[PDB]
Design a protein around this ligand. Sequence first.
Ligand SMILES: CCCCCCCCCCCCCCCCC[C@@H](O)O[C@H](CO[C@H](O)CCCCCCCCCCCCCCC)COP(=O)(O)OCC[N+](C)(C)C
Ligand SMILES: CCCCCCCCCCCCCCCCC[C@@H](O)O[C@H](CO[C@H](O)CCCCCCCCCCCCCCC)COP(=O)(O)OCC[N+](C)(C)C
Ligand SMILES: CCCCCCCC/C=C\CCCCCCCC(=O)O[C@H](COC(=O)CCCCCCC/C=C/CCCCCCCC)COP(=O)(O)OCCN
Ligand SMILES: CCCCCCCC/C=C\CCCCCCCC(=O)O[C@H](COC(=O)CCCCCCC/C=C/CCCCCCCC)COP(=O)(O)OCCN
Ligand SMILES: C=C(C)[C@H]1Cc2c(ccc3c2O[C@@H]2COc4cc(OC)c(OC)cc4[C@@H]2C3=O)O1
Ligand code: SF4
Lengths: 83, 70, 115, 105, 98, 156, 175, 71, 318
Amino acid sequence: AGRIASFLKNAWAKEPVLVASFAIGGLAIILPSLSPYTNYAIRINRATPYNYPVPLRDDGNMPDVPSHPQDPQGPSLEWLKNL
Amino acid sequence: MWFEILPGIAVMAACLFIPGMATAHIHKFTNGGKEKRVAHFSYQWNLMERDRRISGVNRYHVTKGLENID
Amino acid sequence: MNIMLTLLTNVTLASLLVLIAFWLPQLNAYSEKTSPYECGFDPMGSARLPFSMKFFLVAITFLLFDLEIALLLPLPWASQTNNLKTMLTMALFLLILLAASLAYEWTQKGLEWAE
Amino acid sequence: PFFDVQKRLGLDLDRWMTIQSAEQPHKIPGRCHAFEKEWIECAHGIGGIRAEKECKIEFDDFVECLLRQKTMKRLSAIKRQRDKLIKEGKYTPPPHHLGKEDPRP
Amino acid sequence: MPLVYMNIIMAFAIALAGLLMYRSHLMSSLLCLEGMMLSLFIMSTLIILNTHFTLANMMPIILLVFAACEAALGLSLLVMVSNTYGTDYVQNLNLLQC
Amino acid sequence: SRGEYVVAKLDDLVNWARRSSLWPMTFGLACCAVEMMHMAAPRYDMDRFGVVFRASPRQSDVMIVAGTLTNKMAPALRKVYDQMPEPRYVVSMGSCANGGGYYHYSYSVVRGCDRIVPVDIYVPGCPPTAEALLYGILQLQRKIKREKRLRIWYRR
Amino acid sequence: MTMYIAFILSTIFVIGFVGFSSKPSPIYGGLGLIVSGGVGCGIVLNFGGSFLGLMVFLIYLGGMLVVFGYTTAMATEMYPEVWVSNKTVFGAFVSGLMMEFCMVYYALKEEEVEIIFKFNGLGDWVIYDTGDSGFFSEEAMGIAALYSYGTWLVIVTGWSLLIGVVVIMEITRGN
Amino acid sequence: LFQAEKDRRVLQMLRENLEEEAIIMKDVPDWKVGESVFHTTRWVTPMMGELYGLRTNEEILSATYGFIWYT
Amino acid sequence: MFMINILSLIIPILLAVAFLTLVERKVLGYMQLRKGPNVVGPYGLLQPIADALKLFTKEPLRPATSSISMFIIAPILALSLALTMWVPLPMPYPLINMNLGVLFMLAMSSLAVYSILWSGWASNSKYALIGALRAVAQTISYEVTLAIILLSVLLMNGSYTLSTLITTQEHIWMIFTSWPLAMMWFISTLAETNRAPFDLTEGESELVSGFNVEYAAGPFAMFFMAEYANIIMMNAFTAILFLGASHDPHTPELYTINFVLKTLALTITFLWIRASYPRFRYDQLMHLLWKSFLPLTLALCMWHISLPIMTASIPPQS
Ligand SMILES: CCCCCCCCCCCCCCCCC[C@@H](O)O[C@H](CO[C@H](O)CCCCCCCCCCCCCCC)COP(=O)(O)OCC[N+](C)(C)C
Ligand SMILES: CCCCCCCCCCCCCCCCC[C@@H](O)O[C@H](CO[C@H](O)CCCCCCCCCCCCCCC)COP(=O)(O)OCC[N+](C)(C)C
Ligand SMILES: CCCCCCCC/C=C\CCCCCCCC(=O)O[C@H](COC(=O)CCCCCCC/C=C/CCCCCCCC)COP(=O)(O)OCCN
Ligand SMILES: CCCCCCCC/C=C\CCCCCCCC(=O)O[C@H](COC(=O)CCCCCCC/C=C/CCCCCCCC)COP(=O)(O)OCCN
Ligand SMILES: C=C(C)[C@H]1Cc2c(ccc3c2O[C@@H]2COc4cc(OC)c(OC)cc4[C@@H]2C3=O)O1
Ligand code: SF4
C-alpha cells in the first residue's frame, strides 16, 4: 500500500511501456474467467453447422428428437438472434 | 505555390486507378458481367463444376434457371 | 497456374530491363574504372576478411522466436473450437513463456551488444 | 523401459494421435478409415505374434489402400494394352473418353 | 511410391551424405543438417496430406520447432569454436583423440 | 535520307536525357565547395534543373573540381574520375582548380586539375558565385545538347 | 504424368540439395537451401498444404538470413568457393547431378527398386482422393487442433523453446 | 441432391470404365474383367486414378489440380 | 486474357513509381522552403522520363573483384518481388485470390531482403558489406514484431484472406479497434521499407551510398523502382488493413478511388516523415523494437486473443 505504490509510481516514471504491457497482460489473463459472455462464445461455436446432421433411425421411443426441422423439438437459436 | 505538387499527385492517382478498375472490368467481361465467382473451399468449386457441366456450353457463368425443368 | 504465369512475367520483365541496361549504352571498361571503391585511395585489405558481429546472441534469439510465431500463426482458426477455455489457456501459456524468455534474456544482459 | 503411466493414471497424453481412426476434429475421416478400423478390431487382444499371421488379410487391405500398388499395376496393364492396340489401330476409343461426353449433374 | 517420394528421400540421402563428409567449414555441415530437416518436413507433409490424417497436420510444425533449437544450438557452438581459433575449421577440433 | 533523320532524332532524344538528368558527385576540396553548397541552397535550387548530388562515383555523371588540388590528393582525384561510368564530364571551378590560382607557385599544389583529368567547362572566380557556377552548369548542358554520337556513327 | 509440375519441382528440389550438399562457400549453400525451400513450398502447395508450405518457406528464409549474418562473420573465406572454382566441389556437384539423372532415367524408363521398392510413374495425380465436401480446410483444422487436442505437445514445445533460450545464453557465456 | 448426383456420376463413370476395360481386354490369357484388388467385398471409394485413367488429360488436370490452381 | 490483367497491374505501378519520385522531390522542396523540379516539362512532369532515359542510356560497370552472377541476380530479384507484391491485394477484386494472402505477402518480403544481402556481398566492397550487415540487423529487429502485429490485428478478421478485410470493416475502420497496434505497425513498415528514420542500409551520411554504392545506371534504377514500389505497396496494405472502405458490388470504382486516395495519403505521410527527423543508429532501432515494441505487442496479442472470447464476438470464417 505504501511500498508497492511508490514502486509503481517510480516504474511509471521510468518505464511506462513495461507498466502498460504488464497491465494489459494481466487484464487479458484475468477478465476472461470473470466474464458471463464466454459461455455464449462457446455456445455460438457449438451452434455452427459445419457438417451434415445425419438423421437417426426411428425406433418409436425418441420424444426429444424432431421428425421435421420445423417441429417444436430440438435445439433453438432464438437466444442467438437477440444477442 | 504549394499547389504545384498537385499535378504529380494527380498523375499518381490516375496511374493507381488503372489496376483495380481494369481488374474489375476484366472480371465482369470474362465471367459474363457478374463478378467472377470466388471458390475458397472445395464446396464452392464443386458448385462451379456442376454449373459448368449443366451449362451445356462448358462455361460456368452461363446460368440455367427455371426454363430447364420443362 | 496464374501465379506461375505472374512470376514468369515479372522475372522476364526484370531480365529484359537488365539486358537493355547492359546492351544499349556504349561501354569502355578498363582496369582503373572497375577497381573497388574506397574514397579514392586504394583499400587496404579485402571484403572477404571476417566482420565481427556484435548481435550474434540476438540473432540466435531471433531464430528461436521466429519459430514461436509459426506456432501462433494458426490461432485464428483455433478460436473456432468448442473447447474455448482449453485453447485460450494454451495460447496464453505459450505467449507467457515467450514473454518469460524475453524477460530472462533481458535481465541477463543478453540484449546488450558486445563491445 | 516403457513405463505406462498413461494407462495407470488414465491420462491420454499422446494416444489421441497414434491412429487415424481416433476422433478427428469435425469428424473428418481418414482416407483408409474403414480398413484400419477393421484391422484394429481384428487384432485387438490376440497379441502381436498371433496378429501378424491371423489378421494378415485386413492388414494387406489396409496397406494396399495406403499405397495402391496393385491398383497402379492393374491400371498400367490396362493402359499398355490399350496403347499397343491403338498403335496398330484396332481399338478406336469411344467419344466419351475423348472429352465428348454429354455431361450430367 | 510415386517419383516425388523417391526424389524427397534421395534429397534426404544427399543431405546426410553431405553432412557425413566435411570439407573445412562447420557452417556447411550445419547447412546440410538444416537441409535434412527441410527434406523430412516435406516428406512427412506429403505423407500426411496424401492419407488425410487430419490430427497429424500439426506434427510438421512441431518438427520445425525442434529444428530451430537444434540449429540454434549448433550456431552457438560454432561461435565458441571461432572464439578459440578465429576460424570455424573442423581441423582445429583435434585436441581429443581416440 | 530517312536514316539520317532517324539518327538525328535519336541523338537529340539521347542528348536531352543526359543533359536533363545531370548527377554531380558529392565531392569538394576547399573554398569553392562552399559556393557549390549555395547552388544547392533554396535560392538557386540546382535540383530544379535536374541536378542531384550523388555520393557514389558510379552513380555520378559530373565531377565538379571545387578547390585546390594538392600533390597528395591528385591520385585520389584521378581514381574517382576513372571510376565514373561513361559518359562523364568534368567542370573546373575556381582559380585553384583552373590553373593553381593563389597557390600556383607552391611545391605541394597541382597547377590546374587539367593535368590530371580532361576538363569540359572552366568556371573562373575565387570563388565563382553560385550564379557563376550555375551558368557554367547550363553551359555544360548546352555543350551536351550540341554533341553528336549517332550522326558520327552513321557517317563513319 | 500431366504437366510434370510436381516431378519438375521435385527435380529442382534435389538439384538445390546437391548444390548445398557439395560443401562450397556458405553463401552459396544458403542460396541453394533457399531455392530448395521455395520449390518445396511449391511441392507442398500442389498437394493442398498451402499453410505448411508458406510456413516452411517463411521459417527457412528467416533462418538463412541469420546464417548469412554468421557466415559473413565466422566463415568468411577470403577467396569464397563456387561450384566451378574448386576441383572437389565441382566433382561432388557433378556426381550428385549424375546420380539424380540416372535414378530418374531408370525409374522412368524402367521399373527398378533402389532401396525400399520400385515405382511405375504415371504422375502423382493418381494417388489423390476426390474428396468433395466442406466450408473449411482440412489442413487448417488439423493445424488448429494443436491448442485443443495437442495440449501436451504445446507444453513440451514451449518448455523446449524456453530451455533453448536459456541454453543459448549459457553456452555463449564464455569466461 | 448433390450426394445423389455424385453417386450416380461415380457409378456411371465406373461402369463405362468397366465396359471399355472389357473391350480392350479381348485375348489376355488369365485376365478377369472387373476383378477387384481388395479381399473385402465392401464398397471402396474410387481412387480418381481409377476414374479418369482412360480419359483425356485436360479433365485429368481439372479433376486433380482444378481447385488448387483456381484463383 | 490474364496477360492483359498482368500488364495492367504492372505498367501503371511502374508509372506511379516514376511519378512518386517527382512527388517526393516536390514535397521535400516545398517543405524545405524551395520549389523542386519545375523546369523539365510543365510543373516538372517530364522529370521522371528524363531521369529514366538518362539512367538506361548510361553505361553499367562490373567490378573485377565482385561475383558477377549474384551481382546481376540481385536487382532482378528485387524488382520481380516488388512487382509480385501487388497480385493478392484486393482493389476491391484481387488479381490472385488466395486463402492465405497475408502469409504470402509476409513470406515474399523475407525473400526480398536477400537481394539487398546479395547486393552488399557480391559487390565485394567494404562499404557494400557494411550496408548488408545493417540490413541483416534491421530484418532481425522488425520481423517478429511485425508478424505478431499482423496476427493480433487479423484475430478480428477471422482469416488470412485479404478480401474478408472489406467485410470486416463494413461499418467502422479497424484503426478504431486497434489504434495502439496500427501505430507500431506503421513504424514497422518504415523499418521494412528502409525509410527514414530507418534508412540505415543505404545511409548516405555514413556509408556514402550503402549496399548499392557499386551499382550504376540500369541496375541502380531497378533497385530504386523496387524501393518505391515496395513503399506504395506497403502503404496500400496499411490502408486495406486499417482503413476499410465500403464496397458496392455493382460499383467497384468508388472503392478503388477511395482506396487509392487513402494509399496516397499514407505515401505522403512517409514523405512528410522523411524530411522531419535524423537517422536512427542501427542498434537503437533493434533496442526500440525489442525492448519497447515487443512487450506491448505480446500484451496486445494476449488482449486480442482474449477479447472476442470475453465479448462473444469471434469472427465467422473457420
Ligand atoms: C503428478 C505430478 C503432476 C505435476 C507435475 C508437472 C510436470 C509435468 C508437466 C504437466 C503435466 C500435466 C498433464 C496435462 C496434460 C494435458 C491433457 C489433460 O490435462 O487434459 C487437457 C486439459 O487441458 C487443460 O487446458 C488443462 C491443462 C493445461 C495446463 C496449464 C499449464 C501447465 C504447465 C505446467 C508444467 C509445464 C512445464 C513448466 C511451465 C512453467 C484436455 O482437456 P479437454 O479440452 O477437455 O480435452 C480435449 C480432447 N477432446 C477435444 C477430444 C475433447
Ligand atoms: C514510346 C517510346 C518509349 C521509349 C522511348 C521514350 C519515349 C518517350 C520519351 C520522351 C519523349 C519526349 C522527350 C523530350 C521532350 C521534349 C522536351 C523539350 O523541352 O525539349 C526541347 C526540344 O528537344 C529536342 O529538340 C528533341 C528532344 C526529343 C527528341 C524527339 C522525340 C523522340 C522520341 C519521340 C517519342 C517516341 C520515341 C520512340 C522511340 C522508340 C529542348 O528543350 P531544352 O532546350 O533542353 O530546354 C531548355 C530550358 N530552357 C528553355 C529554360 C533553357
Ligand atoms: C505473468 C504475467 C504475464 C502477463 C503480463 C506480461 C505481458 C508482456 C510483458 C513482459 C514482456 C517482457 C518484460 C521484460 C521485463 C524486463 C525489465 C528489465 O529488466 O529492464 C530494467 C528496467 O525495468 C524496470 O524498471 C523494472 C520493471 C519495471 C516495472 C515492470 C512491471 C511491474 C508491475 C507493473 C504492472 C502491475 C499490475 C498492473 C497495474 C497497472 C495499473 C492499472 C532494466 O532496464 P534497461 O533497459 O536494461 O537499462 C536501463 C538503464 N540504462
Ligand atoms: C481498456 C482496455 C484497452 C487495452 C489496452 C490498450 C491501451 C494501451 C495504451 C498505451 C498504448 C501506447 C502504444 C503505442 C505505441 C508504443 C509507442 C512507444 O512506446 O515507443 C516509443 C518510441 O516511439 C518512437 O520513438 C517512434 C520513432 C519513429 C517516429 C516516426 C514518425 C512518428 C509517427 C508519425 C505518425 C504515426 C501514425 C501512426 C498511425 C498511422 C496509421 C496506420 C517509446 O520509446 P522510448 O521513448 O525511446 O523508450 C525507450 C527508452 N526507455
Ligand atoms: C548535399 C547537399 C545538401 C549539400 C551539402 C554538400 C554539398 C556539396 C558538397 C558537400 C556537401 O556537404 C559535405 C558535408 O559538409 C562539408 C563541409 C565543408 O566545409 C566545412 C566542405 O568543404 C569541402 C565539404 C562538405 C561536404 C561536401 O562534400 O551540397
Ligand atoms: S579558387 Fe579561391 S575560393 Fe576557390 S578553393 Fe581556391 S582559394 Fe578557395
